[PDB]
Design a protein around this ligand. Structure first.
Ligand SMILES: C#CCCCn1c(Cc2cc(OC)c(OC)c(OC)c2Cl)nc2c(N)ncnc21
Length: 209
């Protein structure tokens, strides 16, 4: 069964602001997502110093960027800690409620969208370039899940029966039609070099086809 949930009003409100505001510097979505991956990798690494069996689901700690022009997707893959079902439906949204308010406040004081990450809600910058975001994730403690949202005030969560991923997260960006520059290898390298050059995990940029 696919379950459908409503975003908290404040999140819905943040998402519409990100979709509707005129803001050309969309490219920062990628450093926000890579940074989320790096944090998630830090987390599993740390946890495994006191419980080595936490890496039975995979020793390798890395990030893959995978463009597919045929599907028009850019996928950010990591072997980090993953997210549980409670993370997906409740935990992360509760936390996010306070960062959203603060971010929205800051924007009315002349902050700009690029600073979203300082408020712990940078995930939602995905909606600068994606019409739909699909997140497949597996945490050691839980089953594999798929989250998706096209905004519009709702998201879904289902158990994922696709290919098992071991441990980690895939964020699949279904790009807006005018945002296909982020499928281009030279454009991606440029952004990773500009914004994400000092990440402490290998970042492999996959090419097509
Ligand atoms: C906020 C924040 C960071 C924690 C959640 N998270 C994120 C960002 C994130 C935040 C969310 O809510 C605030 C969220 O749900 C709406 C979310 O999921 C669909 C993601 Cl991927 N990316 C990763 C990742 N690659 N690996 C592990 N946890 C992640």
């Amino acid at each position: 069964e696919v379950e459908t949930f409503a975003f908290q009003a404040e999140i819905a409100q943040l998402m519409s602001l990100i979709i509707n505001t005129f803001y050309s510097n969309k490219e920062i979505f990628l450093r926000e997502l890579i940074s989320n991956s790096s944090d998630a990798l830090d987390k599993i690494r740390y946890e495994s110093l006191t419980d080595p069996s936490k890496l039975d689901s995979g020793k390798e700690l890395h990030i893959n960027l995978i463009p597919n022009k045929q599907d028009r997707t850019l996928t950010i893959v990591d072997t980090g800690i993953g997210m549980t079902k409670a993370d997906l439906i409740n935990n992360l949204g509760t936390i996010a409620k306070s960062g959203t308010k603060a971010f929205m406040e800051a924007l009315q004081a002349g902050a700009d969208i690029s600073m979203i990450g300082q408020f712990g809600v940078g995930f939602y910058s995905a909606y600068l370039v994606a019409e739909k975001v699909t997140v497949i994730t597996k945490h050691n403690d839980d089953e594999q899940y798929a989250w998706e949202s096209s905004a519009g005030g709702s998201f879904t969560v289902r158990t994922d029966t696709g290919e098992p991923m071991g441990r980690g997260t895939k964020v699949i960006l279904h790009l807006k039609e005018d945002q296909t520059e982020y499928l281009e290898e030279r454009r991606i390298k440029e952004i990773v070099k500009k914004h994400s050059q000092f990440i402490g995990y290998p970042i492999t940029l996959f090419v097509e086809k």
